[PDB]
Amino acid sequence: EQCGRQAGGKLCPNNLCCSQWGWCGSTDEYCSPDHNCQSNCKD
């Protein structure tokens, strides 16, 4: 619930990528659609 819908849209600093599980981070798993990204998704 760090971010994403499962958090009420709680964006994170450093513009990190928010995973599906609702977690901020700078990984493909958190940024790519292959893993159901939420916000700051890298196209």
| DSSP sequence for 4-39 | SGGGTS---GGGPEEPTTS-EESSHHHHSGGG---B
Q: Which residue has the tokens 């890298």?
A: 42
Q: Which residue has the tokens 């159901």?
A: 36
Q: What gap in Å lies between CA 10 and CA 2, rounded to an integer? A: 6
- Give the residue numbers spanning the domain of 14: 1-43
CATH number at residue 16: 3.30.60.10
Total tally of structural domains belonging to the chain: 1
